Amino acid sequence: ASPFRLASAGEISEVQGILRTAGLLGPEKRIAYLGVLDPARGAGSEAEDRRFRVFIHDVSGARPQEVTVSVTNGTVISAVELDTAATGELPVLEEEFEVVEQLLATDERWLKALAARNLDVSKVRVAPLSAGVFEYAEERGRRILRGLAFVQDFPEDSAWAHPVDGLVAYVDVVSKEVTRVIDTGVFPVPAEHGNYTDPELTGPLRTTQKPISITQPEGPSFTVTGGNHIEWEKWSLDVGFDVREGVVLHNIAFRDGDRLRPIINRASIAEMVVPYGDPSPIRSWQNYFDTGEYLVGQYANSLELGCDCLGDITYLSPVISDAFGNPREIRNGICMHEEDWGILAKHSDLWSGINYTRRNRRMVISFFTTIGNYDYGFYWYLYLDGTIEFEAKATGVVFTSAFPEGGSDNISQLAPGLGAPFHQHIFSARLDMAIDGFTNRVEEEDVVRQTMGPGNERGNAFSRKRTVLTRESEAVREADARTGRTWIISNPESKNRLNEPVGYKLHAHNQPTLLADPGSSIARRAAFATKDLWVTRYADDERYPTGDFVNQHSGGAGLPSYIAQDRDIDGQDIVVWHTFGLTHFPRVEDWPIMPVDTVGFKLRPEGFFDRSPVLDVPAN
Amino acid sequence: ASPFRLASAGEISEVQGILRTAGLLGPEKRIAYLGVLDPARGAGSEAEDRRFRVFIHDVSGARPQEVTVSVTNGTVISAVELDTAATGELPVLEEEFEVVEQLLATDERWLKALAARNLDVSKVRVAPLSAGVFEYAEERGRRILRGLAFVQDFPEDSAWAHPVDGLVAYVDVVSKEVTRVIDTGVFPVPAEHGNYTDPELTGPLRTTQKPISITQPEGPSFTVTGGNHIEWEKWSLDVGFDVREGVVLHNIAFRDGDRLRPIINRASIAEMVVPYGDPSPIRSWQNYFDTGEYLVGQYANSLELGCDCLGDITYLSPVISDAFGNPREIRNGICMHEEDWGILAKHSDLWSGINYTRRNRRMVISFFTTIGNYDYGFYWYLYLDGTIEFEAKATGVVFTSAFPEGGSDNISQLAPGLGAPFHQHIFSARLDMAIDGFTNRVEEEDVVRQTMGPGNERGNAFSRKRTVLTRESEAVREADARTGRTWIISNPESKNRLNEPVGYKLHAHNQPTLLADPGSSIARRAAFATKDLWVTRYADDERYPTGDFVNQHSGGAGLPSYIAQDRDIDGQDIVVWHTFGLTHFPRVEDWPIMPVDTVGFKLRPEGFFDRSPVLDVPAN
C-alpha cells in the first residue's frame, strides 16, 4: 500500500489508456519520458494519489507536451504545450539512434566524404550525439543530432577502433534533413582492430583463476516487503526507479532503539555530464548529459547471476514505458545483496586482558547502464556503522579519434594512429536531507592551524571551525583538500545526549570540477559542475541541477536560477547537491576495453548517535 | 635458497650465540631491535650473506651498541657504541611498559597527587609514553618515559574511560628515578564505564545477521614457495617481515608475456606518527612514533580464522627476537588471501551485439598491530589490472582526557566529563622503485586549464603538464587536489610499443599533512610529515624518514638531511617517500571503541603495458 512503491505494468497501461482517450497519444506521438511523481510534502493524509509525469514528443513537427496524469483518479491533471526554443528539447529517443546513420547514407555530401576515404557506406556506423547549443542560429527550436562516423569491418567488429576523423554532420531529425556536412580533412582510419574477444588479441585465456564461492546458507539478512521496501541491520528504506535518474533511494532511516530516525528523504544521481577537452571543430561541441539528455535508467542492463552480481542476490525488475506507452520490464535490472566488509572494530587491551574483534558488512544496491560506448555501474552502500556511500564505476570503451601525426595536447595515443580525447565524467548527487526530520542546516568545517605562542607554547595545537550556511546565495561552496574541508548536515532542534545537534558529515573525494572555460557553452549549461557543493531550499519542481529539458537548452536553468531566490536554509527543509567526477586522461591500459575506475562520496554520522551504534553486533 | 627468505628461529639462535660469545649479550643487555638486512645492490654474485642488525640496550647505564652480525660467516662484522645524546635513544622496550607505573607507585609526590583525588594506587594504570624532546635540559642523554594515569575500577575494566587529568610524571627508566611530577589541578575522573562487552552497555546482541560463507572449493589461486614467495595472477613478490616496519614487500614484479617486469623493489610503511593537538601542558608534548619508537611489528596480533581473516586464508608466522635473543613465533601474524572485487570490465555494444563482463579480484596481504590504546591493520592489495594499493585501518580506543567544564577548542566531548584530544595519524610509505629496472624518474603531473580564444574558440579544451624532478633539492612536493596533481614514476629507457616511457601513476588521497606549527619540536622531528612527496637517490643506509634512532632524537635526521645531498634522480635508482594520514576530530560514535577508519594510496599503470593487461581473464 506504500506510495513509494515501484510503478506497475498495470499503472503504465492505465496511463497509456488515459492519454489515448484524451487524444494525446496519436500515431505520431512518442513518450520520451514517463515517471511516477513523489508524494508532495505532507503525506500525513494518506490520501494516496499515484501521479505520473509524461513528456510527449511529436514526430510530425507539432509542439511537444508535458502532461501530468493521475492513475488514482483516471484523469489528466494538466497538459502544457512546450516552446522548445525557450525551455529546451525533449530527451533523445531510442528510435532516433538509427535515424542519424540512415539520413546520412543518402546525403550526397556525406557520400562524397566517404568516397574520398574509400569507405563503403554499408560499413559506416554513425553515433547519435546530442548537439548542445553553439553558434548555428538555424538550430534554435529544431531537434538536432550530430553524427560522428566509425567503420565496422564486419558485423561483430568493434567500430570504436576505426574512427573517421575530420568529418562531422548535423541532422534535423524531425524534418529528416541533413543541415551541414563538415569535412576538415582526411585522416587515415586506424587499422588495428579492438576486438577484446578475438583469441588473436587475448591470447590463451588464463587457467590459473580458481573459483571464489560466496553463499549465504541461511539466506540474506535483509527483508524485502511491498516489492521495494528494505529492512537490513537497523536500516530502512525504499528502492525506487526512474527512467531518467535510475535507482533512487527514498526514506533512508535508521532504527536507533525503539525509534525510527530519518536521515535522507531522497537520494539520487540527478545528472551526469561528460565534457570533452579536444578543441578540434570535429569534437569541440561534444558534451553528453547521459542522465538529462539520454535517460540512464532506460538503458539499464539485465544483470547476470555469477557474472554481474556474485553471492546471494535479490533482484528487482523495474517497469518503464516504451515510446508508445507499453510497459516494459527491465528483468533483473537492480541487484541487492550484503557483502562482508572486513574488520568493523578491534582492540586487544594490555590492562583488561580483553581481546575484541567484530566484522563489518555492507548492503549493496546497484544497477548498470550502457549509453553508446560508455558503461556505468551505480552502487549505493549502507554499512553497519551508519555510513552511507555512493560509488560510480566507469568502464566500457573510450571514445576515440585519430591521433594526429605530430602529437596532441588534448588527445592520448592508444594505438598506432588511434587517439582518445581528454574528457571528464561529472556526477551530481541530489540529497534531499532529513537528519532526524526536516529542520536541517549545513556547516562548512575547516581545519584551523594555530601559531606557536601564548596558549600554544609548544606549537602543537590545531583546531577546527564551522561556518553555518544561512542563505542560498552563500551556499555555493568549493572543496579545499588542504584544509580538510567537509560539510556537516545537522538538525539544530535534535540534540544527542551531550546536548550537541545531531549530524552527518559529507566526505568528498576532492577531484577537479568542470575544467572548461567559464565563458563556454558547457560552463553555462552545466553550471552545477563548476562547484563542489550547493544547498537549496526544498521545492517540488526543483528536481534536476540542469532543469527539466537539458537537450539543446541554452543554459542557466537549474541550480543557478534556484539559488537566486536566496531562500532561508538555516534549520529548514533543504537539499544538498554534491558535484564529483573523474578527469580522464586515457591511458594505453584503457584500450581496447576499459578497466573499471571509480569515484564517489560518503556520509558518516557526526554525533548522530549517543555512542557507537554497533556495540550490539555479535562475534562471528 | 632465497636471500629474501624470512628469518628462521635457527638464524635468531645463531645470532644470540654469536653475540653471547663476543661478550655483547651479558645479563644486563637487552636486544631492542633485531632484523635481517636486505642484500646490497648487485646481488648478481649470489654470494649469499645473511646479515642481521641489532640494537643492544644496557639496563645498567653503559652505552648501547649497534651491531651487525653475519650468520653466514658466524662473525661480528661491526659493533659501535652509541652516544645517545647525539644520535638518539634506542626504541622503547616491552619490559619498560610496566616500569613507569611501578616507579611512580612508591614516589611520594605521585602518591600525594593520587591521595588528593582519593584514588587507590592499586587501581591506577600509567601509560608508558615516549618523551620527545622539549625544554628539560636534564633529559638530554637520559632514557625518559612520561606517564599519564587511568583508573581501572576492576581488573577487566576499560581504564581509558577514566583518565586522570591535570597530572603527568617523567621517569628516568635506567636510573629508576622520578624526575618530575606535575600537578596542574584536580579534574573529576569521568565516572561512566566504557566496557564494550558489558551487556548493560551493549544491550541484547543482534539476532538478525545471517552468515556469509566464503570458500574456495579448489583452493586459492596463488602459490607460496620458499616460505614467503608469492605467485598470483602474473604477480610475483616476496613477503618480508621486520620487527620495526611490519610487513615489507620485496621484488614486486609482473609477468607480461614471457618476461618478468620489475615494478617495486621494496615497499614498506617506514614510519608513522600520532601528533596530538591539545595545548594543555599535560599533553602538549605527546607525539608517538609507533613505528620508530615502539616497533609496530613486535606487537602484531595473532589473527583468528573467521574473525580477523575470512575465507581461504594462508598464514605466515614470522619469527622475531625477544629481549634476550630467543626466537619467538608470531603465530598466524600475517594473513594472505584473494578476494572478489566486483566488475573488472563491462561493455554491451549496440553495433557488434557483443555483451562482455569480467570480474575483478585482489590479493590481500595484511597484519594487525596493537600499541597501547591503538590498533592498526596494514593492508596491501594487488589487483588483476596491475594496480597496487595500500590501506591503513585505524581502530581501537581513542586516547582520552577530561572534558573541561566550559568546553575546548582542541578536545571533543565523548561522554559526560570525558574528552578526546584532537590528533593526526600520519604514515610514511617508502617505495624503492624499479619500474622495468632501476633507471627511474618522477614527474609531477598537473591538469592545465586553457582560456577561450584562438585555437580554443569554444573554451572546452584542457590539457595536462608534466614536470621532471631532476635533483633531490626540487623533489619535495606538495599535493594539489584542485589541479588533480599526481606523480608518475617512469623508466625513460624502457618504452612501450607507442615509443612512450613506461610508467606508474601515484594517486594520493590529498589529506592534510602535519598541522603543527613549523617551529615546533614535532615539525622538526617529523619533518617528513610536512610534505606529501619526497624523492631520494637510493642509498643503503637511508632506511627511515626519521633516521635510525627516533626516540628522544632532537630533530633534523632522516629526509631533510638526505635530500641536502642534492643527488641526481633523473633516470637513477630512486626511492619515493609518500606522506599520508588521517586528521581525527573524535566523534561520539568513536566511543567506547572506534569503528574502523581508513586512509591509503594507490599506484596504477600509466602506459606500462601495451594494452589492457586483463584481456586474457576468462568469464566466470
Ligand SMILES: O=CCc1ccccc1
Ligand atoms: O554518452 C553519449 C555519447 C554516445 C551516445 C550514443 C552512441 C555513442 C556515443
Ligand SMILES: O=CCc1ccccc1
Ligand atoms: O602509541 C603509543 C601511545 C601508548 C603507548 C603505550 C600505552 C598507551 C599508549
Ligand SMILES: [Cu+2]
Ligand atoms: Cu572516461
Ligand SMILES: [Cu+2]
Ligand atoms: Cu585517531
Ligand code: NA
Ligand atoms: Na530536505
Ligand code: NA
Ligand atoms: Na629504486
